[PDB]
Structure 1
Amino acid sequence: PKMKTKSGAAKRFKKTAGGLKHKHAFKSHILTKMTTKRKRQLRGTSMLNKSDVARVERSLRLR
């Protein structure tokens, strides 16, 4: 170990064999305002977009 991952990025992006999975934003502290359809479709664990993979796995030290 002579290369330090961001500890703050490993909290966000867990790595699977399908990619780097993350949770969604807009799911905190203002939730009666939005509809139930917009709280339902952000509740899972999505995947990381192709333009985002290179910036994240330089932070998570994998490039």
Structure 2
Amino acid sequence: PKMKTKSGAAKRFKKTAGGLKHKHAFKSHILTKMTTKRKRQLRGTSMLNKSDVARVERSLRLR
């Protein structure tokens, strides 16, 4: 199959049947500043935004 995916975006984007999951950023290595309201609202696993879909679905070889 002459269509190699990228290896990075296959490790930051799992694919479910309701879009693409991804972990939130900014949560490492300086954490004694931030208020919890900000820590517990970056703990989940969001789904990807619509401006970003057709950019990633070319990096992952879906197109």
TM-score (norm 1): 0.96
- Give the superposition deviation at 1:58: 0.4
Post-superposition Cα deviations, 1:16-40, rounded to whole Å, max 9, x if no partner, equal 0000010001111111111111110
Unaligned runs of 5+ in 2: none
Alignment length (residue pairs) = 63
Percent identity between matched residues is: 100
Structure 1 outlier segments of 4+, above 2 Å: none
Q: TM-score, normalised by structure 2?
A: 0.96
Rounded Cα–Cα distance in structure 2 between residues aligned with 1:30 and 1:56: 29
Distance 2:26 2:37 in 1: 13
Q: Deviations over 1:8-63 (max 9, x none)?
A: 00100000000001000111111111111111011110000000000101001001
Question: Unaligned 5+ residue runs, structure 1?
Answer: none
Q: Aligned-residue CA RMSD in angstroms?
A: 0.6
